[PDB]
Amino acid sequence: EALLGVYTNVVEFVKFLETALAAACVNTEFKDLRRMIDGKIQFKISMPT
Amino acid sequence: FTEYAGAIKTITSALQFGMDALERGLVDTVLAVKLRHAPPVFILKTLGD
Q: Coil, strand, or helix at residue B10?
């Protein structure tokens, strides 16, 4: 006698680009980030008098 | 060439610095003349009537 069961699905959630939190961050898809050691940003601020 | 033309960018931005810090000298010294000739409210109000 073959028996069947009832399974309920995993409740899916709104993705990251579809929330309003991404208005605070700038999103890029860096494909190979496990190869990166460091990443730097360099500012150069000239100051008037 | 990229050492020459990167050295003419320094000496212009050091000399745009000179004039654009001297336009601040107008705005400061014009405001400083006004503050030498600005007696306060409580003195000047009762002389106004």
A: helix
